[PDB]
Structure formats: C-alpha cells, structure tokens
Design a protein around this nucleic acid. Structure first.
Ligand SMILES: [Mg+2]
Ligand SMILES: [Mg+2]
Ligand SMILES: [Mg+2]
Ligand SMILES: [Mg+2]
Ligand SMILES: [Mg+2]
Ligand SMILES: [Mg+2]
Ligand SMILES: [Mg+2]
Ligand SMILES: [Mg+2]
Ligand SMILES: [Mg+2]
Ligand SMILES: [Mg+2]
Ligand SMILES: [Mg+2]
Ligand SMILES: [Mg+2]
Ligand SMILES: [Mg+2]
Ligand SMILES: [Mg+2]
Ligand SMILES: [Mg+2]
Ligand SMILES: [Mg+2]
Ligand SMILES: [Mg+2]
Ligand SMILES: [Mg+2]
Ligand SMILES: [Mg+2]
Ligand SMILES: [Mg+2]
Ligand SMILES: [Mg+2]
Ligand SMILES: [Mg+2]
Lengths: 88, 218, 129
RNA sequence: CGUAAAGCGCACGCAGGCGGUUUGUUAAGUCAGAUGUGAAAUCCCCGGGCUCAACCUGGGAACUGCAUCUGAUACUGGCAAGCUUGAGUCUCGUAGAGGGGGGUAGAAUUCCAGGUGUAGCGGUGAAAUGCGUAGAGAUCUGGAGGAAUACCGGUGGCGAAGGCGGCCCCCUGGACGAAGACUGACGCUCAGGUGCGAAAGCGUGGGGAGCAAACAGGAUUAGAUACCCUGGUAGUCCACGCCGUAAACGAUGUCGACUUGGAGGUUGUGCCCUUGAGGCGUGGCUUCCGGAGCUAACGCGUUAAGUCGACCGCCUGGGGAGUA
C-alpha cells in the first residue's frame, strides 16, 4: 500500500515517537497520505471500481476517526486538520 | 477384578461423544476405557444382579455376534438362566404373546422327534418339517421355558443389540449392557464400559455374571 | 456487537443447561455478579466465583436435580431495545410464585418477593423457573 | 418471512435506534411516600327504600392520569477520570482467474494467393436446399484478420455482490498468519441518500474470424410463422455514456455471543525431531455426512433453518395486478 519509509516518516512527524503508531493523529495522517497518493491512480484508472471501494473505506475510516478526535478534544482536532489541510 | 485386556477400544473415528466421560485417553489412535471407572460400575452391577437373583428373578443374555454366540450358550449351561445366541427377532418382548405360539410349535415339533412319531416313509413328514426344529431352536432355543417376560436384561453389545434395548425400555425391564466406546448409552439403566467383541473380554463378563446369579439364587 | 451482556449471561446458562455442562464461564461484571448472587440464594446455581483482576471471568457452577436441568426456563425480560419498569403492585410472579423474577430496585438487585416485601419497584431483569 | 404471501441484487453511509468494562458525580428516566387535582352520574363493593325486580339512593373503592414537594441510587441516561477483552494502526511474511492499463505467445476456425490432384463434397432418421468439371472436397506452402485461452483445472482459489482462467510488465484493493508495540469504545445497524450491479437492449465512433435473433430457402407435418438442414443481418468484440433488470438463488438480511461430533479440500503457523512422500498442536476459508434441538413436513444441524441480543427490510386468501 504505502512505502515503509513513507509510513515511518509520518509516524515520527505526527506521533509522540517512532513507536507511537496507534495515535489517532498517526492513523489519520497515514490515511490522508494514502488518499492523496491514490488521487493520481484513479485519475488515469477511472474504471478501477474494485480498488476504488478500498479507497472509500479509507475515506470513511478517516471521517470516523476525525469525529472521535473532535469529541475527545476539540483543540487538538483543530490543529490536526490545519496541518493536513483537509475538511474543506 | 481389574486385569489385562478389556481396556482396548475401537478407532477414534467411530467413538460416540456420549461416552466421553468413560474414556481414559486415545492410545495409538484407539480409545482405551477407564478401568478405574469400570470396576465401581461393574462390581455394583453384579451386586444388583445378585439382589435380583435372590428374588428368584429371571435373567436373559443377549449375544448375537459370532465372536460370542457360543459363549452365551455356555453360560446358559453353567447357570439355569436364559439367553439369545443368534439374531434377535424384532419384538421378542413387545409381542411375546405372539411369540408364545411359536414356542408351542417348537414343543410339539420337539415332542414328535422324541417318541419317533416323525419316522414315516414320506420325505415331507421326515425331512421338511424336522428342519423347522433346527431353524426354531437356533432362535428360540434358550427362551423355550422362560414362560414370560424377563426380570432383567444382560446385553454384550449396546449398539449391535439396540433392538433388544428398545424393547426392555418400552416394557421397563432393567437393562444391563456392556456399552463400548462407539456404543450408545442412555438406553441402558446400568452402564458397564469395556470391550464388546474381544473373546477374552466377553468370556470374562458372562463368566463373571454366571457366578453371581448362582450365588444369589442359592 | 455484544449490546446486552445480561442476555449473554442468561443465554450461556440456558445453553449450558441444555448441554449438561458442569459449569459455564464468561466475562465478569458487577451487574452479572449481583444476578449470579440472587440465583445462588434461590438455589438455581450451586456456586459462583470470579477469577482474575484486569479481565475478571465469572464462573457459575450449574446444578442438576435427578439428572435434569434445575433451570427449567430462563428468559430476558428488559432489553436495550425495550426496557420494562414495574411499580410495587405491578411486580410479576413467575409460575404463580413458584419461579422468581430478578428485579433491580434502588436497594440493589433482588428477587420479586424480596422487592415486594421491601415495597420497592424497578427494572425487571428476567424470569427464572 | 429456505420451499405455503413475505429478506432490498450487493454494498458504503447521514438522521435514528442500540452499545464492552471500572471509579466518582448528577438524580433526567426509573422507584418509594406525601400534597393538590382527576365534577356529578355511570361501572364496581358493602348497605338502604319502592310487596320482589328493573329502578331510586347512603358510604366507600375506583378514576390505572397530570403537577408539585421530600427521599432512594440498583439499572438506563448526562458529566469527569479510567481500563483493555470490541474496533483500529504499525513491524515481518504467505496464497490467490481481486481490479485497471499495456505488451506478447501458441493451437485452431474462416478468408486470400499458389502447387499437387479428380468427381464428388456437405448434411440428415432419410432427403433436399447448398457447394463442385469456371476444378470443389481432400492435401501442401505463404499471407491477412478477429475472437477465445486446450492440457493444468480440482463441490479448487479470489471478490461486497454481479463476477473473475494463456504468459509477461506497470499501477492498485482486500484477506490471513507470527510474536511484539501502540490508540483506548473510536462500536453495531441503517429509512432517506449515494455507489456498484450478469445477459439482453440503447447512443456515438471503430471492429467483425466464429457463432447467431430477425430473415430466406430446403425438409418434417393434416398445417409447422417451430423442433432438424443449408445460408445469414443485428448482436456478440473495443472506447465512452446510458439502461438498473435476472430462478441478481444458499429461493435463507447484517453484526455479536453461546451450544455433542466424524471425514476431506485449501492456505498460514508452533513443536518433536534421523530413523519423512513421520508425530502431536494452533489460526483463516471451504465441501460432505450427521447428534441434541428445531421444523407442517421436506429438511437445517458450530458456515443453524438450534439457544439469545441489536437494527433494518418485507408479508396479511386466490384472481384482477406488480396491472391502471
Ligand atoms: Mg491497511
Ligand atoms: Mg411458488
Ligand atoms: Mg414464496
Ligand atoms: Mg452496513
Ligand atoms: Mg453500559
Ligand atoms: Mg428523578
Ligand atoms: Mg367521578
Ligand atoms: Mg330490599
Ligand atoms: Mg351509589
Ligand atoms: Mg453512569
Ligand atoms: Mg437508502
Ligand atoms: Mg452486453
Ligand atoms: Mg452497441
Ligand atoms: Mg456498432
Ligand atoms: Mg439455423
Ligand atoms: Mg427483482
Ligand atoms: Mg445457486
Ligand atoms: Mg429474493
Ligand atoms: Mg440476498
Ligand atoms: Mg446435516
Ligand atoms: Mg408497471
Ligand atoms: Mg417485470
């Protein structure tokens, strides 16, 4: 799916350390990176419906995590969306 | 008492889950019966059989497999109890009144041979009907003088003789059976786990039972 | 998803009784222990115990009388989809009082007879016969 | 609600419904008591009076409700802090016709050109139409083009369903296993809605070998607008868009827990290891037979149509009619 080097970079950037992978920010950041990457894939492969279904799951999963984070702590949620530049 | 043999069972493929409590383990792919559990049940069974014997009760042995067909007959000679050595006719107890006339026919057939009134020139009178003697006694030989339903049942195989078990349950006669790993329990009021086909195992059972009835009968 | 753990507790007992199992085990909770305690006093279950601290497991020692299940019939009454509350005078009696109904009152979980004597209503948990 | 009427073709999901476990707190729901109110009559209970009754009438109960006040805190809800078993992320691997794009290979049908060669070929129950002395069929050589991937191949595999088989490359989704770490209820279901959805069909532009609706002829038959035969167009193929229906079937909605067994297939993994085309374990998926139980019966049976929980869909005699 995503390269290990790219995955490791995001975890350190958004997580507490290189070992904090379960954080809601790392999870959202990982999903956001994949969705952005797949934009080029579906730009050319418009008919790849089977792979698109997988993409929609990432979109749905990200929204579920985002809403949970907003409920838990609004201030931290606001920073996360600002850094990733989503929710437009 | 506990001794060699008997512990052996059948293949684990054909085991009956209902008998899980009485299996000690799976040795060499064949279940082996828990003798330490068999003895308390086996020993108590003879105690009850002795108690029924003390009441002048009638015990009936049920053995159909050829590995024990002759064995049950020998017990019927050591003690004066009844037995079945061949196929169990469907309904030997549920409709014993129907089977009564069959017994009477055997008595009349038996009588004719004794005094020689069957010695006639015609082959029909001499050969065709006398063969009914062999056919009848091989199935009703041990039940000729029962004169009624039995007060207890002894069965060497709880699945191969499931017809016999059903009749006893319907009539309420207590059932004592050697129920094997693959056999079906819950149809017998007394459970005696162990082998049901080994020659050295079967002979021990009826040989053991044949003694207690004699002691109880006195 | 498991949305009503109580019916899981009742279902396990019913399934365990049908299968003639000696005992049944499941995740433990304060509410489950309270119901388990009530059953123990009434004599429906022989004994109960709780093992573990971080993930405690509740263990119920089922009992049988004359080779048949003691719990003839157990069924959930109040459910998350439809919850049942009864007043002091509306407390039901199972099998004309032969059975018991577990009711959670302000003073704790107790049988309907105890709640009626104490003059308190509350949620009706289940009927046990 | 498998087969009698009844599970959307399948999914993702807002509103809604419901929600693991621990402590504290709130006391809304809930529960206890009291107060006010709930007209009288009527119903009901115990009495009274018309000679009895109907009828009349005293008292009580009832009016299951609503509102307040005072308490209770088990349960549900709100709030705060938690927790790891639900769910999810990360690390290392494995299998697979999962999807999209491109390239390529072999067998073969048809067609075209040529060589050899001569009277049949083809087809059927029989026959004819048809093809052939303008040289067919057969046979060899060369070329052109289209479509599908023999053997492997398997109640085998993958996918939400529909569905997906030569080989190679690029892009890409999901599942599963091993231990370890991390987040700490972030979950389940889903009206409306949105997406996907065999084949046929439609629009535009290509392609078109084979097959083949329609159509034509020859047979069959009392007739044959059929079955059979010789031909043959759309279509079947590609790009894009539309259509949104199937016996879209397991005639069985999704999620979770629980409940005797036996024999296989397939794909990970641990352990014993010299007495290996071995021995004992632990996961995922899957086929068959069967116990209790269930079912009108047939049958289902740990992949339930058994025992339960959450939510949604749908049914209410047949026809008229899934029609106006
Ligand atoms: Mg992933
Ligand atoms: Mg029908
Ligand atoms: Mg139907
Ligand atoms: Mg869904
Ligand atoms: Mg809760
Ligand atoms: Mg309140
Ligand atoms: Mg009134
Ligand atoms: Mg009067
Ligand atoms: Mg009155
Ligand atoms: Mg609370
Ligand atoms: Mg909708
Ligand atoms: Mg089509
Ligand atoms: Mg077209
Ligand atoms: Mg066209
Ligand atoms: Mg044709
Ligand atoms: Mg339909
Ligand atoms: Mg089918
Ligand atoms: Mg349907
Ligand atoms: Mg369906
Ligand atoms: Mg079956
Ligand atoms: Mg219509
Ligand atoms: Mg239609």
């Amino acid at each position: 799916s995503l390269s290990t080097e790219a995955t490791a970079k995001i975890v350190s950037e958004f997580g507490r350390d290189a070992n904090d992978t379960g954080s809601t920010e790392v999870q959202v950041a990982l999903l956001t990176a994949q969705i952005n990457h797949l934009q080029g894939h579906f730009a050319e492969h418009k008919k790849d419906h089977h792979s698109r279904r997988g993409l929609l799951r990432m979109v749905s999963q990200r929204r579920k995590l985002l809403d949970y984070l907003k409920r838990k702590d609004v201030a931290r949620y606001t920073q996360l969306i600002e850094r990733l530049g989503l929710r437009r | 008492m506990l001794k060699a043999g008997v512990h052996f069972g059948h293949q684990t493929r054909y085991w009956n889950p209902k008998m899980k409590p009485f299996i000690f383990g799976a040795r060499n792919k064949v279940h082996i019966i828990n003798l330490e559990k068999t003895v308390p049940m086996f020993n108590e069974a003879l105690a009850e059989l002795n108690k029924i014997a003390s009441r002048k009760g009638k015990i009936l042995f049920v053995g159909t497999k050829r590995a024990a067909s002759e064995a049950v007959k020998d017990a019927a000679l050591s003690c004066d109890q009844f037995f079945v050595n061949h196929r169990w006719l469907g309904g030997m107890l549920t409709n014993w009144k129907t089977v009564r006339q069959s017994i009477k026919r055997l008595k009349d057939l038996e009588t004719q041979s004794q005094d020689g009134t069957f010695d006639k020139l015609t082959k029909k009178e001499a050969l065709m009907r006398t063969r009914e003697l062999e056919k009848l006694e091989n199935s009703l030989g041990g039940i000729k003088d029962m004169g009624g339903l039995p007060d207890a049942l002894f069965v060497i195989d709880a699945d191969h003789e499931h017809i016999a078990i059903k009749e006893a349950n319907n009539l309420g006669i207590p059932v004592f059976a050697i129920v094997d790993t693959n056999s079906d329990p819950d149809g017998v009021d007394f459970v005696i786990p162990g082998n049901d086909d080994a020659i050295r195992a079967v002979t021990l059972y009826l040989g053991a039972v044949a003694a207690t009835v004699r002691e109880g009968r006195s | 998803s498991m949305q009503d753990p109580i019916a899981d507790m009742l279902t396990r007992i019913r399934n365990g009784q049908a299968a003639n199992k000696a005992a049944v085990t499941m995740p433990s909770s304060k509410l489950k222990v309270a119901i388990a305690n009530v059953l123990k006093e009434e004599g429906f279950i022989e004994d109960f115990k709780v093992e573990g601290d971080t993930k405690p497991e509740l263990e119920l020692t089922l009992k049988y009388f004359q080779g048949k299940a003691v719990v003839e019939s157990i069924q959930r009454v109040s459910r998350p989809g439809l919850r049942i509350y009864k007043r002091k005078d509306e407390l039901p009696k199972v099998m004309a009082g032969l059975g018991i109904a577990v009711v959670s009152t302000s003073k704790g979980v107790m049988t309907d007879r105890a709640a009626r004597q104490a003059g308190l209503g509350g949620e009706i948990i289940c009927y046990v016969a």
